[PDB]
Motif scaffolding. Structure first.
Motif, PDB file in Angstrom:
ATOM      1  N   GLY A   1       0.901  -1.322  -0.040  1.00  0.00           N
ATOM      2  CA  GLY A   1       0.050  -0.037  -0.008  1.00  0.00           C
ATOM      3  C   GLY A   1       0.750   1.286   0.168  1.00  0.00           C
ATOM      4  O   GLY A   1       1.813   1.547   0.839  1.00  0.00           O
ATOM      5  N   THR A   2       0.481   2.410  -0.751  1.00  0.00           N
ATOM      6  CA  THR A   2       1.338   3.372  -0.948  1.00  0.00           C
ATOM      7  C   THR A   2       1.383   4.299   0.195  1.00  0.00           C
ATOM      8  O   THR A   2       0.765   4.340   1.015  1.00  0.00           O
ATOM      9  CB  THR A   2       0.589   4.061  -2.286  1.00  0.00           C
ATOM     10  N   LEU A   3       2.454   4.994   0.147  1.00  0.00           N
ATOM     11  CA  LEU A   3       3.038   5.863   1.300  1.00  0.00           C
ATOM     12  C   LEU A   3       1.829   7.152   1.417  1.00  0.00           C
ATOM     13  O   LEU A   3       1.450   7.493   2.329  1.00  0.00           O
ATOM     14  CB  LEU A   3       4.320   6.224   1.275  1.00  0.00           C
ATOM     15  N   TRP A   4       1.734   7.637   0.127  1.00  0.00           N
ATOM     16  CA  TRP A   4       1.136   8.949   0.111  1.00  0.00           C
ATOM     17  C   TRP A   4      -0.487   8.743  -0.048  1.00  0.00           C
ATOM     18  O   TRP A   4      -0.805   7.930  -0.711  1.00  0.00           O
ATOM     19  CB  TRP A   4       1.627   9.660  -1.287  1.00  0.00           C
ATOM     20  N   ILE A   5      -1.114   9.277   0.929  1.00  0.00           N
ATOM     21  CA  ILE A   5      -2.691   9.458   0.908  1.00  0.00           C
ATOM     22  C   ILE A   5      -3.244   9.914  -0.085  1.00  0.00           C
ATOM     23  O   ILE A   5      -2.749  11.037  -0.527  1.00  0.00           O
ATOM     24  CB  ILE A   5      -3.133   9.589   2.308  1.00  0.00           C
ATOM     25  N   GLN A   6      -4.353   9.464  -0.493  1.00  0.00           N
ATOM     26  CA  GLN A   6      -4.782  10.077  -2.018  1.00  0.00           C
ATOM     27  C   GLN A   6      -5.811  11.130  -1.315  1.00  0.00           C
ATOM     28  O   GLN A   6      -7.200  10.742  -1.354  1.00  0.00           O
ATOM     29  CB  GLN A   6      -5.441   9.168  -2.939  1.00  0.00           C
ATOM     30  N   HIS A   7      -5.312  12.251  -1.463  1.00  0.00           N
ATOM     31  CA  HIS A   7      -6.238  13.402  -1.197  1.00  0.00           C
ATOM     32  C   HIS A   7      -6.581  14.204  -2.399  1.00  0.00           C
ATOM     33  O   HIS A   7      -5.818  14.657  -2.987  1.00  0.00           O
ATOM     34  CB  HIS A   7      -5.605  14.562  -0.322  1.00  0.00           C
ATOM     35  N   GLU A   8      -7.655  13.870  -3.039  1.00  0.00           N
ATOM     36  CA  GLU A   8      -8.154  14.389  -4.323  1.00  0.00           C
ATOM     37  C   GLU A   8      -8.554  16.044  -4.268  1.00  0.00           C
ATOM     38  O   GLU A   8      -8.528  16.523  -5.356  1.00  0.00           O
ATOM     39  CB  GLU A   8      -9.557  13.599  -4.554  1.00  0.00           C
ATOM     40  N   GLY A   9      -8.532  16.405  -3.083  1.00  0.00           N
ATOM     41  CA  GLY A   9      -8.472  17.970  -3.047  1.00  0.00           C
ATOM     42  C   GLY A   9      -7.406  18.719  -3.166  1.00  0.00           C
ATOM     43  O   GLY A   9      -7.479  19.990  -3.394  1.00  0.00           O
ATOM     44  N   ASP A  10      -6.272  18.116  -2.992  1.00  0.00           N
ATOM     45  CA  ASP A  10      -5.095  18.670  -3.289  1.00  0.00           C
ATOM     46  C   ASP A  10      -4.672  18.104  -4.605  1.00  0.00           C
ATOM     47  O   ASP A  10      -4.500  17.158  -4.708  1.00  0.00           O
ATOM     48  CB  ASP A  10      -4.120  18.465  -2.107  1.00  0.00           C
ATOM     49  N   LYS A  11      -3.827  19.175  -5.387  1.00  0.00           N
ATOM     50  CA  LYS A  11      -3.364  18.788  -6.610  1.00  0.00           C
ATOM     51  C   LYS A  11      -1.797  19.306  -6.574  1.00  0.00           C
ATOM     52  O   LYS A  11      -0.793  18.758  -6.900  1.00  0.00           O
ATOM     53  CB  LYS A  11      -3.897  18.961  -8.034  1.00  0.00           C
ATOM     54  N   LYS A  12      -1.768  20.735  -6.387  1.00  0.00           N
ATOM     55  CA  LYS A  12      -0.502  21.514  -6.375  1.00  0.00           C
ATOM     56  C   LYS A  12       0.067  21.023  -4.928  1.00  0.00           C
ATOM     57  O   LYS A  12       1.121  21.302  -4.903  1.00  0.00           O
ATOM     58  CB  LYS A  12      -0.648  22.951  -6.693  1.00  0.00           C
ATOM     59  N   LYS A  13      -0.867  21.006  -4.017  1.00  0.00           N
ATOM     60  CA  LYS A  13      -0.362  20.840  -2.697  1.00  0.00           C
ATOM     61  C   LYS A  13       0.381  19.417  -2.444  1.00  0.00           C
ATOM     62  O   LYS A  13       1.403  19.414  -1.888  1.00  0.00           O
ATOM     63  CB  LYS A  13      -1.643  20.795  -1.757  1.00  0.00           C
ATOM     64  N   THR A  14      -0.264  18.363  -3.120  1.00  0.00           N
ATOM     65  CA  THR A  14       0.428  17.266  -3.005  1.00  0.00           C
ATOM     66  C   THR A  14       1.668  17.100  -3.826  1.00  0.00           C
ATOM     67  O   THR A  14       2.652  16.402  -3.268  1.00  0.00           O
ATOM     68  CB  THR A  14      -0.612  15.951  -3.253  1.00  0.00           C
ATOM     69  N   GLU A  15       1.563  17.976  -4.857  1.00  0.00           N
ATOM     70  CA  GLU A  15       2.900  18.130  -5.694  1.00  0.00           C
ATOM     71  C   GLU A  15       3.840  18.730  -5.028  1.00  0.00           C
ATOM     72  O   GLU A  15       5.004  18.305  -5.079  1.00  0.00           O
ATOM     73  CB  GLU A  15       2.365  18.653  -6.884  1.00  0.00           C
ATOM     74  N   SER A  16       3.567  19.609  -4.213  1.00  0.00           N
ATOM     75  CA  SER A  16       4.692  20.481  -3.372  1.00  0.00           C
ATOM     76  C   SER A  16       5.209  19.549  -2.276  1.00  0.00           C
ATOM     77  O   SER A  16       6.248  19.633  -1.958  1.00  0.00           O
ATOM     78  CB  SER A  16       3.869  21.609  -2.905  1.00  0.00           C
ATOM     79  N   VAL A  17       4.244  18.829  -1.453  1.00  0.00           N
ATOM     80  CA  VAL A  17       4.717  18.067  -0.455  1.00  0.00           C
ATOM     81  C   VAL A  17       5.629  16.824  -0.984  1.00  0.00           C
ATOM     82  O   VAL A  17       6.359  16.203  -0.223  1.00  0.00           O
ATOM     83  CB  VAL A  17       3.634  17.456   0.724  1.00  0.00           C
TER      84      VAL A  17
END
Lengths: 49, 336, 45, 97, 241, 325
Positions: B155-171
RNA sequence: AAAAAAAAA
RNA sequence: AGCUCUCUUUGCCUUUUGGCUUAGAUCAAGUGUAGUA
């Protein structure tokens, strides 16, 4: 079949086509892949539109 | 179903028709608490037409780890063994060719005592086991030990927050490095362990999981213990502040150890953004989770390859150089 | 995708684009809209 | 490597373009072809490679009457006409056979 | 790619460069009726008039003093092959003259390249070609020999290498402004644009076979010649199956 | 630049201790490492100007500024030798490699030509070349597999092509004389045949089971080379067969109410019937008198697990492969 | 029987 | 019926579009997965 190649004789395989020619080529390949829906659409247009 | 083509030697997660046993358990699990209904969306003659049971799973899987395990038990005569069903005759040839390319087996189809057992008794994927056992003879080991901890993880490390696109890209870019996904994972582990103080909410702002990655911490402990029974002293210099070694050469050391261990999975990037193998036949795309999905590269290694319904994706991209691969695979590569 | 039905976003962006560029530059106006061509913008107006 | 132009004009080639050098181990030979002629060879006209229309129409009529002949005495025999009896009649006819 | 008009025009002119390179011997002609004959710098290529595509393609072929490196490569190969044949030729010593560094592309005047000092007074023959067999030995004796090598980029109208080396030997030994160490030497000419070789002048006995075998060997396998051929092949995009 | 890229890189990501963090996402600085198709790229040179610099690479200038020379000049080498001192018996005999007469771009495209290929004795990823070889008839009969050495070590350890892997099969034969069972049946020791490989059809669609589908149509039929017309002036193929029109034609030689739209199964599933039923076999008899005979770490053992597989198979009684002999 | 057309502390 | 301040209305326009031609010409586009844990 015949109609499709007539349209495709208008365009060489290579080239700098703008948007409308590649839309036409997409429509021609779609007609080749799905001919029944294309023929039904043609008859619907020919009756209705 | 997951299948493994041995001629091309790639995985494939392909949508197979169900088995008669599968639709049977379907109907059985339908009506549990109250008399229910089944809605098989196919004809009765089609229902007659499916196979009675599932496809045998040893005909569509990597026989390399299980041939490795059967040699680890000591049954070297893998040809004369009482299997329930016989595997295909050429898939296991690809399997044992993979075993030879990682060392392990000799020219005479026998397990090597020093190295082969050490890749044998681990519960990790064999290629990166070969990566791990080559570290001590060349240098840094604990970093790729950490990578071995986190690659034995589904199972992947990063949780899938669909509300963040540039924010998950930044983190992701908060941790990312251009020299492969493995260095990014090593950075997230070193951020969690050295300063994170085992704290879950810090992972909650960082879009990171908690349970699977502390399970990977326990995995790192188990691997370190298993190498402690290998007799090799563990160079745990992460706690020490000795940063006098230059980090660029140490990152080169890490990826060089990887390409000693991952020399088989080598690909070259093509200027339409795609990836091709050494033979230049199969089309490979970067998986939409690595950072190298949106980065430029020339030669890459990937942890795995899998064929989905439409496109073939390659996973855990890391940068390499050509002369490294010519140096560390003299039996497997040769110049034109 | 370069097709579809006209949404409210696209109609308002088309009217503001026409307010800025006029009725004789449909390529600029169509550059504003992602799914619509100059001919489709002209036909919509 | 030439341009590959086809010509429809009377273009004479002087004989200076009919010589060639060759290197051997006992000497080097500078051959000059066409010495026995004082006559230049001429660039081939394109119009000498195209069959005139009248002759093409006449042969079309003739070879199509021949085809109808072999069709009549072929269907009272075999079922399909072969590709050996029409090799002589291959590139003939305005609707080419 | 997103490409500027200067670059669009450069890409559009590339096949004309390849066509002009391929037909260069018949385009860069000597029978010309008009055209100020200039010399390309650091090479021995004479241009009549101005043809820019031919000049840019020829500069690309001969980049980085490749004419000079070809001359150095051929003269040092000849010098070492000379160094393997002192005993049977009665050659006392072999020397490589390196006075003028840039003489390989000077066509008005030439100097000697390789010197051979003789143990005994050789009986030189009449000046004859390399492939000439009717050797007429004269009674005049001498004790020194020199070898000169020169590179020619011939064209369609003037690529006869025997007449070229005859004219060059007679012109470079007739005038007094060119300094040669001995009155007897050997002129070697290398038609670079057609791959021809020739030699003309005096011969002490035994030299002719060595010259012809060495010349065949180095026209087959000189390295600077090889990179010249590779550059021409890459410029034409003409391959062998 | 300089200070801005440094301090916003330090601000965006102090957490990248190993490697190099990505350049900042800003309108000021550019992300050089990101991919930018091929229809978005600008053709720039090493310096970084939109400019070409070759005769055959699209430039209006070749060489060192339209000159065959260079900035450093060129100096010939001296070479002296004689009877007393020769060149061929020298300790450091510098041979004449064809690489000191090359430029940096000659070396660059020469190593560009030096492609990488996998070895013949080991199969690489996706090596799809045997399909055209095998489907050739006598050519596929004469030409064999390229002896990938895993196969030949399998031959060494006792395996043969044409049959699979398993225990020995004590089947008599098939002599080809029909199905005659009157043979003595003395049953030599044989090997199990190979199971066929599964070749699964590609499923890119949500089409249902058993659907053949709407059939698709086909297009109506359909000293080597030239200099070329340029890659921009080609447009589309305005250089055909100059002599004759048309593509060449292939030539034939001769002339309770259920749900709406849902059907009811006429016969039930057998195992949704035997789940109620008792099965095809009875339980055992279990006579009285029988009684039960008995009345009502792993990591540490793995640490001391020094048993090598040789003695492990010796105490487990499994036959081993022959070694070097 | 040259220019366009190969950039302003 | 004055003079200051405030507000409204009227006037004012006060930062209030500075040529031409074949509307000067032309204008598609990276990849988006994820039986099982």
């Amino acid at each position: 079949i015949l109609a499709l190649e007539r349209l495709r004789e208008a365009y060489s395989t290579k080239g700098r086509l703008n948007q409308s020619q590649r839309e036409e080529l997409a429509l021609i390949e779609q007609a080749y892949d799905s001919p029944g829906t294309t023929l039904e659409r043609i008859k619907r247009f020919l009756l209705t539109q | 179903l997951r299948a493994y083509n041995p001629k091309t030697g790639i995985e494939s997660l392909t949508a197979t028709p169900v088995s008669k046993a599968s639709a049977a358990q379907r109907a059985g699990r339908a009506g549990r608490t109250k008399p229910g209904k089944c809605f098989r969306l196919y004809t009765e003659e089609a229902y007659q037409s499916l196979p009675d049971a599932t496809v045998p799973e040893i005909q569509r899987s990597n026989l390399a780890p299980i041939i490795l395990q059967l040699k680890a038990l000591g049954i070297d005569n893998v040809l004369r063994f009482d299997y329930f069903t016989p595997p295909p005759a050429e898939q296991m040839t690809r399997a044992l060719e993979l075993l030879y390319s990682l060392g392990a087996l000799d020219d005479y189809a026998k397990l090597t005592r020093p190295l082969g057992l050490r890749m044998a008794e681990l519960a990790v994927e064999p290629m990166m086991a070969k990566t791990l056992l080559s570290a001590q003879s060349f240098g840094c080991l604990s970093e790729i030990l950490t990578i071995a901890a986190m690659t034995s993880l589904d199972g992947t490390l990063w949780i899938q927050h669909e509300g963040d696109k540039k924010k998950t890209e930044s983190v992701k870019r908060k941790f990312a490095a251009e020299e492969g996904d493995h260095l990014t994972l090593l950075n997230v582990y070193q951020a969690f362990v050295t300063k994170g103080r085992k704290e879950a909410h810090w992972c909650h702002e960082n879009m990171l999981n908690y349970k699977a990655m502390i399970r990977a911490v326990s995995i790192r402990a188990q691997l370190k213990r298993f190498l402690e029974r290998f007799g090799i002293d563990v160079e745990e210099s992460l706690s020490s502040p000795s940063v006098s070694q230059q980090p660029a050469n140490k990152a080169e050391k890490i990826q060089r150890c990887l390409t000693i261990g991952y020399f088989a999975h080598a690909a070259k990037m093509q200027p339409d953004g795609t990836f091709r193998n050494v033979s230049g036949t199969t089309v490979l795309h970067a998986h939409p989770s690595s950072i190298m999905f949106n980065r430029k590269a020339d030669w890459v290694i990937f942890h795995e390859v899998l064929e989905t319904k439409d496109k073939t994706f390659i996973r855990d991209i890391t940068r390499i150089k050509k002369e490294w691969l010519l140096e560390y695979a003299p039996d497997f590569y040769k110049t034109t | 995708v370069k097709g579809g039905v006209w949404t409210n976003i696209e109609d308002e962006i088309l009217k503001a684009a026409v307010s800025k560029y006029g009725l004789n530059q449909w390529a600029r106006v169509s550059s504003l809209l992602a799914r619509k061509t100059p001919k489709q913008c002209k036909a919509r107006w | 490597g030439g341009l590959g132009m086809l010509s429809g004009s009377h273009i004479l080639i002087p004989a200076s373009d009919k010589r060639w050098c060759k290197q051997t181990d006992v000497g080097i030979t500078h051959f000059r072809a066409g010495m026995s002629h004082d006559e230049e060879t001429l660039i081939p006209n394109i119009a000498r490679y195209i069959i005139p229309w009248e002759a093409e129409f006449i042969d079309s009529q003739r070879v199509w009457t021949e085809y109808s002949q072999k069709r009549l005495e072929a269907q009272q025999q075999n079922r399909r006409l072969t590709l050996e009896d029409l090799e002589d009649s291959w590139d003939r006819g305005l609707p080419r056979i | 790619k997103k490409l500027t008009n200067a670059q669009r025009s450069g890409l559009n002119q590339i096949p004309n460069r390849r066509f002009t390179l391929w037909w260069s011997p018949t385009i860069n002609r000597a029978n010309v009726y008009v055209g100020f004959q200039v010399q390309l710098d650091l090479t021995g290529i004479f241009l009549h008039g101005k043809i820019p595509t031919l000049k840019i393609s020829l500069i690309q072929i001969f980049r980085a003093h490749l004419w000079q490196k070809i001359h150095e490569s051929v003269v040092m190969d000849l010098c070492q092959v000379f160094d393997q044949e002192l005993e049977a030729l009665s050659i006392e010593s072999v020397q490589k003259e390196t006075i003028h560094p840039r003489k390989s592309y000077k066509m008005n005047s030439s100097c000697a390249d390789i010197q051979l000092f003789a143990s005994h007074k050789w009986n030189v023959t009449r000046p004859s070609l390399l492939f000439d067999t009717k050797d007429v030995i004269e009674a005049t004796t001498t004790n020194k020999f020199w070898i000169d090598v020169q590179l020619r980029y011939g064209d369609y109208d003037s690529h006869d290498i025997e007449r070229y080396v005859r004219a060059k030997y007679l012109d470079y030994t007739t005038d007094s402004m060119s300094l040669y160490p001995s009155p007897t030497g050997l002129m070697i000419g290398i038609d670079l644009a057609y791959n021809l070789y020739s030699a003309y002048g005096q011969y002490f006995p035994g030299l002719k076979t060595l010259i012809q075998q060495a010349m065949a060997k180095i026209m087959k396998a000189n390295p600077a010649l090889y990179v010249l051929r590779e550059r021409i092949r890459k410029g034409l995009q003409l391959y062998a199956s | 630049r300089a200070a801005y890229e440094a301090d916003l890189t330090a601000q965006q990501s102090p957490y990248v201790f190993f490697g190099t963090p990505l350049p900042p996402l800003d309108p000021d600085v550019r992300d050089d490492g990101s991919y930018v198709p091929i229809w978005k790229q600008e053709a720039r040179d090493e310096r970084g100007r939109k400019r070409f610099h070759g005769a055959f690479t699209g430039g209006w200038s070749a060489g060192y500024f339209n000159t065959v020379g260079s900035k450093e000049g060129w100096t010939p080498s001296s070479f002296v030798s004689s009877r007393t001192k020769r060149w061929k018996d020298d300790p450091n005999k510098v041979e004449q490699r064809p690489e000191d007469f090359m430029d940096e771009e000659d070396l660059a495209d020469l190593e560009e030509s030096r492609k990488l290929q996998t070895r013949e004795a080991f199969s690489g990823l996706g090596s799809t070349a045997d399909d055209a070889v095998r489907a050739s008839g006598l050519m596929g009969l004469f030409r064999v597999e390229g002896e990938t050495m895993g196969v030949k070590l399998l031959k060494k350890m006792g395996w043969k092509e044409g049959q699979g892997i398993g225990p020995k099969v004590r089947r008599k034969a098939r002599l080809g004389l029909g199905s005659d069972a009157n043979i003595t049946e003395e049953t030599h020791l044989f090997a199990p045949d190979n199971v066929p490989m599964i070749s699964f059809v590609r499923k890119t669609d949500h089409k249902g089971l058993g659907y053949a589908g709407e059939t698709g149509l086909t297009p109506l039929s359909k000293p080597r080379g030239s200099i070329g017309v340029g890659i921009l002036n080609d447009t589309g193929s305005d250089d055909e067969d100059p002599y004759e029109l048309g593509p060449k034609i292939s030539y034939n030689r001769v002339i309770r109410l259920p749900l709406d739209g849902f059907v009811f199964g006429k016969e039930p599933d057998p195992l949704i019937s035997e789940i109620i039923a008792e099965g095809k076999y009875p339980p055992p008899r279990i006579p009285p008198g029988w009684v039960s005979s008995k009345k009502p770490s792993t990591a540490e053992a793995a640490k001391s697990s020094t048993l090598d597989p040789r003695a492990r198979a010796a105490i487990l009684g499994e036959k081993q492969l022959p070694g070097k002999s």
